[PDB]
Amino acid sequence: MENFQKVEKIGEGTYGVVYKARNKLTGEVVALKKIRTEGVPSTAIREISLLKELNHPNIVKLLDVIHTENKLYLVFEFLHQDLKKFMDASALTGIPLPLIKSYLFQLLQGLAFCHSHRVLHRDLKPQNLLINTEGAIKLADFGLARAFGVPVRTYTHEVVTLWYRAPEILLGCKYYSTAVDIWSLGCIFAEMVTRRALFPGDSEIDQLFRIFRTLGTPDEVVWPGVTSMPDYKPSFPKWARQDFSKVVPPLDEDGRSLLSQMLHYDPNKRISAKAALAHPFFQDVTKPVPHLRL
Numbered sequence: 685m686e687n688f689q690k691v692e693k694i695g696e697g698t699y700g701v702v703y704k705a706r707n708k709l710t711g712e713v714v715a716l717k718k719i720r721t722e723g724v725p726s727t728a729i730r731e732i733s734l735l736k737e738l739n740h741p742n743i744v745k746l747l748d749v750i751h752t753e754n755k756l757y758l759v760f761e762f763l764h765q766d767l768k769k770f771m772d773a774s775a776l777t778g779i780p781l782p783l784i785k786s787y788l789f790q791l792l793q794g795l796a797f798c799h800s801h802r803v804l805h806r807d808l809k810p811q812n813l814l815i816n817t818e819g820a821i822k823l824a825d826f827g828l829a830r831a832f833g834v835p836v837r838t839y840t841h842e843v844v845t846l847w848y849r850a851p852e853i854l855l856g857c858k859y860y861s862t863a864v865d866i867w868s869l870g871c872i873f874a875e876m877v878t879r880r881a882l883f884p885g886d887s888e889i890d891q892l893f894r895i896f897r898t899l900g901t902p903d904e905v906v907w908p909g910v911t912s913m914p915d916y917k918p919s920f921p922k923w924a925r926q927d928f929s930k931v932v933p934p935l936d937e938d939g940r941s942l943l944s945q946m947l948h949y950d951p952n953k954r955i956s957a958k959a960a961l962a963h964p965f966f967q968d969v970t971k972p973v974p975h976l977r978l
C-alpha cells in the first residue's frame with residue numbers, strides 16, 4: 685500500500701482481502717478492502733462513489749473509493765468487532781434482551797435511512813454488522829451487491845452463506861425490494877434470541893425447504909403470485925406452518941409479533957423498517973453497553 689501501513693488482516697472478504705490499516709499521513713485507523721479483475725467496470729465506480737454520500741450513524745462510513753492498477757480499494761471507518769464474533773462469544777450466556785432490542789432498533793434505523801434513499805443491502809448477515817464499546821451497531825457493505833454482482837464463492841473459494849436469504853430471492857425473483865433486508869434482519873434477530881441460526885441451509889434448496897418446514901410451504905392465499913415465480917415447482921412438499929412460540933422461545937409476544945411481521949412470505953406484506961421502529965416491542969428500548977474484551 686502507498687499511504688497505508690498494514691496493521692492486521694481482518695479477513696478474506698466476500699470481494700477481497702480486508703486489512704486494518706493506519707493512514708501514514710492522518711494517523712487515522714481504517715478498514716481497507718482490496719476488491720478483485722481485469723479493468724473494473726466504470727458503472728461500479730460511479731455507483732460505489734455514490735455511497736460515499738450515504739452517511740448515517742448506523743451505517744459504516746465509506747471514506748474513499750480508489751481505482752488503480754486493476755485493483756479497487758474501498759476505505760471504511762474501522763470498528764473493532766462484528767456481531768458474528770460477538771454472538772459466538774455470548775453463546776453460553778446469551779446477549780441480554782435489552783441489548784438485542786437496542787441492536788435491532790439501531791439496525792432498523794439504518795435500514796430505514798438506506799431504504800428511504802433507495803439503497804438496498806441485499807446480503808445482510810451477522811458478520812456485516814459491526815459493533816463498538818459504546819453500544820452502537822452499524823451496517824457494513826450497504827450497496828455493494830448492486831455495484832458488483834452475485835456472490836456464490838468468495839475470492840478464496842469460501843462458500844457464500846444463504847442463511848439470511850429472503851424466499852423471493854431463492855425462488856428466482858429478478859427484482860429485489862427493500863423487503864429482502866427486513867427478512868435478513870428478522871433472521872438475525874431470531875438468532876440473537878435463540879443463539880442458533882434460524883434457517884441454516886447448506887444449499888439453495890435446503891435453505892428454501894428449511895424456511896418452508898418452519899413457516900409452512902407458501903401458497904396463493906398467503907403469497908399471491910408465488911406459484912408463478914421462476915423457480916417455483918408444484919412438486920415442492922407441502923409442510924404445515926409451526927408456531928413462533930416454538931420458533932423463538934422464550935421471546936415475549938411483542939417480540940414474536942414483530943418477528944412474524946419481518947418474516948411474512950409476501951414481500952409486499954412484510955413490515956417496512958419504518959413501521960417496525962413503531963412496533964410496541966420497542967416501547968422500553970434503551971442503549972446498554974456490551975461487554976467487549978478487545
Ligand SMILES: NC(=O)c1cc([N+](=O)[O-])c(NCCO)cc1NCc1cnc(N)nc1
Nearest residue numbers: 694695697702715760761762763764765766
Ligand atoms: N470496517 C471494519 O472495521 C470491518 C470491515 C470488515 N470487512 O471489510 O469485511 C470486517 N470483516 C468481517 C469479519 O470478517 C470487519 C470489520 N470490523 C470488525 C472486525 C472484526 N474482526 C477483526 N479482526 N477486526 C475487526
